[PDB]
Scaffold this active site. Structure first.
Site, PDB file in Angstrom:
ATOM      1  N   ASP A  31       0.815  -1.208   0.000  1.00  0.00           N
ATOM      2  CA  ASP A  31       0.000   0.000   0.000  1.00  0.00           C
ATOM      3  C   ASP A  31       0.848   1.257   0.000  1.00  0.00           C
ATOM      4  OD1 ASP A  31      -2.589  -1.255   0.092  1.00  0.00           O
ATOM      5  OD2 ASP A  31      -2.047  -1.826   2.158  1.00  0.00           O
ATOM      6  N   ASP A  65       7.430  10.539 -11.084  1.00  0.00           N
ATOM      7  CA  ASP A  65       6.045  10.937 -10.806  1.00  0.00           C
ATOM      8  C   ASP A  65       5.704  12.379 -11.237  1.00  0.00           C
ATOM      9  OD1 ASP A  65       7.168  12.438  -8.761  1.00  0.00           O
ATOM     10  OD2 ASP A  65       6.591  11.052  -7.155  1.00  0.00           O
ATOM     11  N   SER A  80      18.316  21.163   0.417  1.00  0.00           N
ATOM     12  CA  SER A  80      17.345  22.027   1.114  1.00  0.00           C
ATOM     13  C   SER A  80      16.020  22.221   0.363  1.00  0.00           C
ATOM     14  CB  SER A  80      17.995  23.368   1.483  1.00  0.00           C
ATOM     15  OG  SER A  80      19.002  23.173   2.474  1.00  0.00           O
ATOM     16  N   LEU A 116      12.481  21.705  -0.701  1.00  0.00           N
ATOM     17  CA  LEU A 116      11.638  20.510  -0.698  1.00  0.00           C
ATOM     18  C   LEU A 116      12.396  19.307  -0.120  1.00  0.00           C
ATOM     19  CD1 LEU A 116       9.779  19.881  -4.054  1.00  0.00           C
ATOM     20  CD2 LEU A 116       9.413  18.490  -2.025  1.00  0.00           C
ATOM     21  N   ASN A 120      -2.488   2.641  -6.432  1.00  0.00           N
ATOM     22  CA  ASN A 120      -1.243   2.951  -7.136  1.00  0.00           C
ATOM     23  C   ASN A 120      -0.360   3.892  -6.326  1.00  0.00           C
ATOM     24  OD1 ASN A 120      -1.461   1.563  -9.850  1.00  0.00           O
ATOM     25  ND2 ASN A 120      -3.355   2.798  -9.919  1.00  0.00           N
ATOM     26  N   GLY A 165      -1.017   6.357  -4.682  1.00  0.00           N
ATOM     27  CA  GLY A 165      -1.649   6.739  -3.421  1.00  0.00           C
ATOM     28  C   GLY A 165      -0.970   6.060  -2.250  1.00  0.00           C
ATOM     29  N   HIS A 167       8.027   9.532  -0.956  1.00  0.00           N
ATOM     30  CA  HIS A 167       9.346   9.723  -1.563  1.00  0.00           C
ATOM     31  C   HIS A 167      10.144  10.737  -0.772  1.00  0.00           C
ATOM     32  CE1 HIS A 167       7.127   8.548  -5.521  1.00  0.00           C
ATOM     33  NE2 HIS A 167       7.374   7.492  -4.769  1.00  0.00           N
ATOM     34  N   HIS A 171       5.794  12.850   9.561  1.00  0.00           N
ATOM     35  CA  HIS A 171       5.011  13.892   8.918  1.00  0.00           C
ATOM     36  C   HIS A 171       4.443  13.445   7.572  1.00  0.00           C
ATOM     37  CE1 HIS A 171       4.154  18.054   7.453  1.00  0.00           C
ATOM     38  NE2 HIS A 171       4.483  17.497   6.302  1.00  0.00           N
ATOM     39  N   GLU A 172       5.281  12.828   6.741  1.00  0.00           N
ATOM     40  CA  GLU A 172       4.872  12.390   5.403  1.00  0.00           C
ATOM     41  C   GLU A 172       3.837  11.273   5.465  1.00  0.00           C
ATOM     42  OE1 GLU A 172       5.597  14.037   2.754  1.00  0.00           O
ATOM     43  OE2 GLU A 172       6.883  15.391   3.923  1.00  0.00           O
ATOM     44  N   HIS A 181       0.414  12.422   5.701  1.00  0.00           N
ATOM     45  CA  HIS A 181      -0.185  12.619   4.374  1.00  0.00           C
ATOM     46  C   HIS A 181      -0.656  11.302   3.741  1.00  0.00           C
ATOM     47  CE1 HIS A 181       0.947  16.753   4.586  1.00  0.00           C
ATOM     48  NE2 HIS A 181       2.236  16.570   4.353  1.00  0.00           N
ATOM     49  N   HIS A 184      -1.640  19.766   5.798  1.00  0.00           N
ATOM     50  CA  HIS A 184      -0.893  20.608   6.736  1.00  0.00           C
ATOM     51  C   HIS A 184      -1.796  21.300   7.758  1.00  0.00           C
ATOM     52  CE1 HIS A 184       2.627  20.798   3.694  1.00  0.00           C
ATOM     53  NE2 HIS A 184       2.958  19.993   4.688  1.00  0.00           N
ATOM     54  N   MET A 196       2.213  17.947  11.785  1.00  0.00           N
ATOM     55  CA  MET A 196       1.738  18.259  10.439  1.00  0.00           C
ATOM     56  C   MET A 196       1.834  19.744  10.059  1.00  0.00           C
ATOM     57  SD  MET A 196       1.294  15.229   9.405  1.00  0.00           S
ATOM     58  CE  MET A 196       0.789  15.743   7.765  1.00  0.00           C
TER      59      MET A 196
HETATM   60  C1  LIG Z   1       6.983  15.949  19.618  1.00  0.00           C
HETATM   61  N1  LIG Z   1       8.133  16.379  18.814  1.00  0.00           N
HETATM   62  C2  LIG Z   1       9.374  16.155  19.282  1.00  0.00           C
HETATM   63  O1  LIG Z   1       9.537  15.586  20.386  1.00  0.00           O
HETATM   64  N2  LIG Z   1      10.460  16.523  18.584  1.00  0.00           N
HETATM   65  C3  LIG Z   1      11.784  16.260  19.143  1.00  0.00           C
HETATM   66  C4  LIG Z   1      12.312  14.891  18.748  1.00  0.00           C
HETATM   67  C5  LIG Z   1      12.182  13.799  19.608  1.00  0.00           C
HETATM   68  C6  LIG Z   1      12.676  12.544  19.231  1.00  0.00           C
HETATM   69  C7  LIG Z   1      13.322  12.386  17.999  1.00  0.00           C
HETATM   70  C8  LIG Z   1      13.879  11.048  17.584  1.00  0.00           C
HETATM   71  O2  LIG Z   1      13.494  10.033  18.123  1.00  0.00           O
HETATM   72  O3  LIG Z   1      14.830  10.949  16.651  1.00  0.00           O
HETATM   73  C9  LIG Z   1      13.460  13.487  17.152  1.00  0.00           C
HETATM   74  C10 LIG Z   1      12.958  14.728  17.525  1.00  0.00           C
HETATM   75  C11 LIG Z   1      10.335  17.133  17.401  1.00  0.00           C
HETATM   76  O4  LIG Z   1      11.372  17.461  16.792  1.00  0.00           O
HETATM   77  C12 LIG Z   1       9.061  17.379  16.877  1.00  0.00           C
HETATM   78  C13 LIG Z   1       8.879  17.998  15.628  1.00  0.00           C
HETATM   79  C14 LIG Z   1       7.598  18.230  15.124  1.00  0.00           C
HETATM   80  C15 LIG Z   1       7.430  18.804  13.976  1.00  0.00           C
HETATM   81  C16 LIG Z   1       7.272  19.330  12.923  1.00  0.00           C
HETATM   82  C17 LIG Z   1       7.114  19.990  11.609  1.00  0.00           C
HETATM   83  C18 LIG Z   1       7.651  19.151  10.440  1.00  0.00           C
HETATM   84  C19 LIG Z   1       8.536  18.078  10.644  1.00  0.00           C
HETATM   85  C20 LIG Z   1       8.998  17.327   9.555  1.00  0.00           C
HETATM   86  C21 LIG Z   1       8.594  17.631   8.250  1.00  0.00           C
HETATM   87  C22 LIG Z   1       7.709  18.693   8.030  1.00  0.00           C
HETATM   88  C23 LIG Z   1       7.250  19.445   9.121  1.00  0.00           C
HETATM   89  C24 LIG Z   1       6.486  17.837  15.872  1.00  0.00           C
HETATM   90  C25 LIG Z   1       6.666  17.212  17.112  1.00  0.00           C
HETATM   91  C26 LIG Z   1       7.952  16.981  17.618  1.00  0.00           C
HETATM   92 CA   LIG Z   2       0.396   2.761  -2.934  1.00  0.00          CA
HETATM   93 CA   LIG Z   3      15.447  19.362  -1.577  1.00  0.00          CA
HETATM   94 ZN   LIG Z   4       7.900  11.544  -5.889  1.00  0.00          ZN
HETATM   95 ZN   LIG Z   5       3.730  17.976   4.392  1.00  0.00          ZN
END
Ligand SMILES: Cn1c(=O)n(Cc2ccc(C(=O)O)cc2)c(=O)c2cc(C#CCc3ccccc3)ccc21
Ligand SMILES: [Ca+2]
Ligand SMILES: [Ca+2]
Ligand SMILES: [Zn+2]
Ligand SMILES: [Zn+2]
Ligand SMILES: Cn1c(=O)n(Cc2ccc(C(=O)O)cc2)c(=O)c2cc(C#CCc3ccccc3)ccc21
Ligand SMILES: Cn1c(=O)n(Cc2ccc(C(=O)O)cc2)c(=O)c2cc(C#CCc3ccccc3)ccc21
Ligand SMILES: Cn1c(=O)n(Cc2ccc(C(=O)O)cc2)c(=O)c2cc(C#CCc3ccccc3)ccc21
Ligand SMILES: Cn1c(=O)n(Cc2ccc(C(=O)O)cc2)c(=O)c2cc(C#CCc3ccccc3)ccc21
Ligand SMILES: Cn1c(=O)n(Cc2ccc(C(=O)O)cc2)c(=O)c2cc(C#CCc3ccccc3)ccc21
Ligand SMILES: Cn1c(=O)n(Cc2ccc(C(=O)O)cc2)c(=O)c2cc(C#CCc3ccccc3)ccc21
Ligand SMILES: Cn1c(=O)n(Cc2ccc(C(=O)O)cc2)c(=O)c2cc(C#CCc3ccccc3)ccc21
Ligand SMILES: [Ca+2]
Ligand SMILES: [Ca+2]
Ligand SMILES: [Ca+2]
Ligand SMILES: [Ca+2]
Ligand SMILES: [Ca+2]
Ligand SMILES: [Ca+2]
Ligand SMILES: [Ca+2]
Ligand SMILES: [Ca+2]
Ligand SMILES: [Ca+2]
Ligand SMILES: [Ca+2]
Ligand SMILES: [Ca+2]
Ligand SMILES: [Ca+2]
Ligand SMILES: [Ca+2]
Ligand SMILES: [Ca+2]
Ligand SMILES: [Ca+2]
Ligand SMILES: [Ca+2]
Ligand SMILES: [Ca+2]
Ligand SMILES: [Ca+2]
Ligand SMILES: [Ca+2]
Ligand SMILES: [Ca+2]
Ligand SMILES: [Ca+2]
Ligand SMILES: [Ca+2]
Ligand SMILES: [Zn+2]
Ligand SMILES: [Zn+2]
Ligand SMILES: [Zn+2]
Ligand SMILES: [Zn+2]
Ligand SMILES: [Zn+2]
Ligand SMILES: [Zn+2]
Ligand SMILES: [Zn+2]
Ligand SMILES: [Zn+2]
Ligand SMILES: [Zn+2]
Ligand SMILES: [Zn+2]
Ligand SMILES: [Zn+2]
Ligand SMILES: [Zn+2]
Ligand SMILES: [Zn+2]
Ligand SMILES: [Zn+2]
Lengths: 167, 164, 167, 166, 166, 163, 167, 167
Positions: free
Chosen positions: F59, F71, F79, F81, F91, F93, F97, F119-120, F123, F129, F137
């Site tokens: 999936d 895609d 940095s 994206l 597919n 879905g 990546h 985070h991904e 999605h 977001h 998120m």
């Molecule tokens: C709850 N929480 C944390 O405890 N920590 C610390 C942390 C604890 C443990 C590890 C590990 O086990 O390796 C790493 C980091 C974060 O950094 C964090 C970060 C975001 C976010 C966002 C925004 C975003 C992130 C990624 C992509 C896009 C957007 C939400 C919650 C948290």
């Molecule tokens: Ca799939």
């Molecule tokens: Ca990039």
């Molecule tokens: Zn892709």
């Molecule tokens: Zn996102």
């Protein structure tokens, strides 16, 4: 989960063997050579690998004995039953026993050890008796005259249906 | 050429068993209750059925022995090998032997006869060892703090079907 | 090739323990209570469950002994080494042994059995030492301070990573 | 802070100690055999082996017969030749050789260098190989010396654990 | 007037099958096991029973082929169409063909033969495609899960609406 | 008339995933652990359940690629994206990546793999977001030295329920 | 510019073949061994080189089928038409189809696959039927006892008239 | 002024590569070793020089992908197409892509990465397929038992006809 294997075969390619004791009828060297060649008959047409062990438990334990020798198939003196082997499986499985009341030879006299060994190891590896009179796995001992030994087609096919062909 | 064709499952569903002799460690009733429950485990999750015979030859012959006990797979005194059973078939096929050099119990003391029997009967019916550490058909005995693990229900439903 | 795959986690959640024998320094009741609380500390923050067996083999076999006591990791008399436990898995796996040349107590005297067991049991479950001086998993024994036991956050997160959180 | 995931050393610098010696070879033959056996593994990894004369080393090497201080007593001539413990504290990494064997620099009896290089594979976290051509295959085979080149399967195995050398 | 009769559902509960040829990808036994299992999925929940013929014309003739293979429903190479089966009825009806330009397996690799065969036999028995994404009879191959195949409720209901319960 | 189907939720709670390939930046074990952790984040607060496949179509297919990688949503080099995933559905879905022109780590360095994959996967399960700067998120990556924030717990439970 | 060749013959010496599917009647190994041998017959007296493909499109596509199997030559159940092959050329050219309503064997029983494949591969390479009753390319099947197989002179002459002798 | 060259060839001897990502099938070390060996095959008989880049744009961008992976040559699951490389040029020119639906190995199982890589880097440097069945640049995979790798003469001539011999 795991259902039992579907045919008595070895679930591994690396097998070991051990010459527990020796016959008085042939030199230690003659006996090692016969057993070595007997295994080569099968390893030449399969991915099977045979490693000799000097001590300990091997997959295929090879021994000489007479009469009662530690199982439900006692030997009978000269002639008749010559040898037997158990099919693949733990413990006694794969083991080959030779009736030391036979006169074992590297020749056309008495019984040819290489020949009976090669046949018995067919049993050790999962083959039953063949209905083709030219096969090595035909039940009755035949010495066809000393030559280059080429494993008959029927035996090649039988062992290959279990383990595939060699590389 | 010929191979050995295999019996991987009992060709029939009305299987019989016989307890040939008994352990010193438990009453006849305790032993019978243990074997009955060991069969119930499997026969609840399959179309298989188990009928007990007091006399004669049955599909599954159960016995208690020590050391060399007539099959050339000898036992080894206390600990180590606990029991063994033979895969499906004629004669010795299906039979289960328990090492009577263990203390068999209806609890955590020594080894639990129901548990080991339930496991050995797995072999008698077509099953081999499991890789999953929580399976009844795992090679290693562990007494936990009885529902047949899902891995074993797969194992056996894959030979005999769900039933019903 | 092959390595040794390892278990750094009891693949199940209903774990058993057995108290094989007892220290002279405390009552049976105080000892069982000390061990109960040591297990409660771990099973309060994880889905882990613990069941006491009175005979037979348990996952975590608990025993008291001195010097060479059957593992080849001998004890050393008064002070120094206090106890040891084996990582998860089979047989000796999970077992915890306490040096009975130590004085075990339920107070600040000698070494507190609850505390040392609590620390040992972390190993039995899947934790190694920390460099956090405040942590329960920290080589050196220190009796604080606080007089109600709350599990330090390092240990809380440490074990929750392997097993998951309470409920 | 969980237990490591393979039995391996968490450090590259390891020490070893030849606690005692066999009667079958000179001290120098033995030292050279063990030195070469370690070099088999250090040549293809970032591992570094430093000999200790006394004290406690990570890898403690000894010759014994029958009961010699663990749960794996030797059995006299032939059979068990030697054993080593996987990485870890105390007995971890230690290698024991059965002095009821005839140890050699040659093809007679059992080659100390060869058996040692095999046992040191275990001391470093390698279990048995299923490749018949590998050093870590369970059964002793001497193939005739010859320059020793560590078979590909043992190279892969040890590097799966420690990475390649510089 | 006259229509074309049927009722693309078997008028007989007892069916035969024949494995005409075999794929290179799996052993004979694995193929036979996979088909055995796929039939059992359906025969567990209905009064249908399936008998295997080694020779002759059976009800469900099973074969592997590629491209044009004799029915003017050509296969398309790797991916895309995996297999097809004809609705119940005489001759080509009930037959199941498998695209041997797919890799067939008894695992998650390529396409699981048992899984596709189970779906295909659903067509062989009168089931068209389902809109329930979780059904075996959903048009799109998805390999879960989920180990130990229990036929989804939609397919149990679906087949029983033709043949009734076991 | 007809519209298109809903990308709301995986009609089944049991999902599969495959790690198709690996980044140079971390080891196989470190990567598996990061994804295993990232799936656990969501499966602890839902009745969702995740199984790893080593072969075939799963999936959620997971891969590392750079620039244009099949895609038509190409990555941009270092940095900017960092990664993307596709809303639930067939597919592509559910697929995630990761931009292998980023440095992936199990720490504050470069970009924490677990954190971006958590985070991904949000999605992959149907979340967009959030305007909450403290949420997982939230659009913008921030490494704050792991308990799933309330907003994301509510978010995913408003699709799959609390389990 | 080019004219169409004067004989249906291959314009290259490197030809590929693919075994599309397999008969139930023999193991995968037996079938591979038989096709390999059948090609060896022709390669041994020519500069032809046959390379096995596992997937994709090969020059000689080999399949087992019954009745309608996708050309203008449906098979006919047991006996009668055993197999056929197309002469060299694009697409279906060179392909060999075998009727799986026959019983294929690696022996004297049923129909020997190696024997039939070798004859059909003659067609695949540009030979038509011979009037020599001792030729492999004689239209009518005959088994003459498992010997070492020596391609008859007529067949040797026919294939050399197209490709010449090799090395 | 300048005209585009007369073959697809690199107009420089210093070429760089980067391994973009890695297969689950082998360790990072096994893969790097396999690509390094692959490049040595060609540098050993030419003046060509290979430098590995860890980040950035290299001449030869190497990746593992499945299905649609960002060009007009999607892979097709297990078996079939194993890998493709572009001829020398800007952008995609020289890049090697490996189908990660294959089982990549450092042995004779599945497909050997070094072997497929060396073939594919031949394309990256400007070789097309050979008609010599014993050549590395022959279209069809063949593993000829593990031995010391010595590039066939046909390939040596091909690569030398572009770049000349190594000094
Ligand atoms: C709850 N929480 C944390 O405890 N920590 C610390 C942390 C604890 C443990 C590890 C590990 O086990 O390796 C790493 C980091 C974060 O950094 C964090 C970060 C975001 C976010 C966002 C925004 C975003 C992130 C990624 C992509 C896009 C957007 C939400 C919650 C948290
Ligand atoms: Ca799939
Ligand atoms: Ca990039
Ligand atoms: Zn892709
Ligand atoms: Zn996102
Ligand atoms: C191919 N082949 C031979 O070339 N030769 C001659 C031969 C060659 C080499 C040596 C030697 O190195 O010492 C000895 C004999 C046989 O005798 C023979 C014999 C059987 C049989 C059977 C049936 C059976 C044997 C043993 C026990 C039971 C049944 C099958 C094939 C062959
Ligand atoms: C589900 N389950 C349990 O509830 N319990 C506790 C238990 C419940 C009820 C009774 C009783 O009625 O007397 C006893 C014990 C087990 O001990 C257990 C044990 C194994 C195993 C294995 C492996 C193996 C066993 C035997 C021999 C070899 C290997 C699998 C499942 C379970
Ligand atoms: C949280 N916590 C406490 O509250 N207290 C006080 C305390 C409360 C309750 C009882 C009781 O019920 O009997 C006793 C003591 C500690 O003493 C302490 C001590 C360590 C440690 C360490 C290092 C180490 C090294 C080796 C073995 C054991 C421990 C970690 C945490 C705590
Ligand atoms: C590469 N290689 C060799 O060149 N040679 C010859 C050789 C070279 C140099 C000396 C020397 O300097 O004294 C002696 C022998 C081996 O014998 C061999 C042997 C094994 C093995 C195994 C299996 C196993 C060994 C020991 C114990 C258990 C199992 C793997 C590789 C090699
Ligand atoms: C209940 N179920 C499962 O348990 N599993 C896992 C599974 C269990 C056991 C085996 C095995 O023993 O070999 C294999 C796979 C499925 O994969 C699955 C898949 C579909 C579908 C569909 C759609 C479709 C479209 C086209 C062809 C085939 C399937 C419906 C139900 C299930
Ligand atoms: C030289 N040669 C033989 O030695 N043998 C015996 C033989 C040797 C080896 C095997 C084997 O390895 O299994 C089997 C049989 C033949 O039978 C034969 C038969 C024909 C023909 C024709 C006519 C035709 C055959 C097939 C189809 C159509 C027409 C031509 C030459 C030969
Ligand atoms: C000289 N040579 C060999 O020595 N060996 C053995 C070999 C040695 C070392 C290793 C290793 O280190 O892992 C593996 C294999 C080959 O296999 C081979 C193979 C081809 C080809 C082709 C055709 C094609 C290959 C790949 C892709 C497409 C087509 C050409 C030459 C050689
Ligand atoms: Ca044996
Ligand atoms: Ca006799
Ligand atoms: Ca004698
Ligand atoms: Ca019986
Ligand atoms: Ca015992
Ligand atoms: Ca008893
Ligand atoms: Ca334990
Ligand atoms: Ca002490
Ligand atoms: Ca004390
Ligand atoms: Ca040590
Ligand atoms: Ca010894
Ligand atoms: Ca000695
Ligand atoms: Ca039909
Ligand atoms: Ca297709
Ligand atoms: Ca296929
Ligand atoms: Ca990167
Ligand atoms: Ca016919
Ligand atoms: Ca063609
Ligand atoms: Ca047929
Ligand atoms: Ca492919
Ligand atoms: Ca480029
Ligand atoms: Ca792969
Ligand atoms: Zn005997
Ligand atoms: Zn016999
Ligand atoms: Zn017994
Ligand atoms: Zn068992
Ligand atoms: Zn201890
Ligand atoms: Zn500690
Ligand atoms: Zn020792
Ligand atoms: Zn060893
Ligand atoms: Zn069709
Ligand atoms: Zn369909
Ligand atoms: Zn045709
Ligand atoms: Zn003809
Ligand atoms: Zn590409
Ligand atoms: Zn190519």
């Amino acid at each position: 989960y795991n259902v039992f294997p579907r045919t008595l075969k070895w679930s591994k390619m690396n097998l070991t063997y051990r010459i527990v004791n020796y016959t008085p009828d042939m030199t230690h060297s003659e006996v090692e050579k016969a057993f070595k060649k007997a295994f080569k008959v099968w390893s030449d047409v399969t991915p099977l690998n045979f490693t000799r062990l000097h001590d300990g438990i091997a997959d295929i334990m090879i021994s000489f004995g007479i009469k009662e020798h530690g199982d439900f198939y006692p030997f009978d003196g000269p002639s008749g039953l010559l040898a037997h082997a158990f099919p693949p499986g733990p413990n006694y499985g794969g083991d080959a026993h030779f009736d030391d009341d036979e006169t074992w030879t590297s020749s056309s006299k008495g019984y040819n050890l290489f020949l009976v060994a090669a046949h018995e190891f067919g049993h050790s590896l999962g083959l039953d008796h063949s209905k083709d009179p030219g096969a090595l796995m035909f039940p009755i001992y035949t010495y066809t005259g000393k030559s280059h030994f080429m494993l008959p087609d029927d035996d090649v096919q039988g062992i290959q249906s279990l383990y595939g062909p060699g590389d």
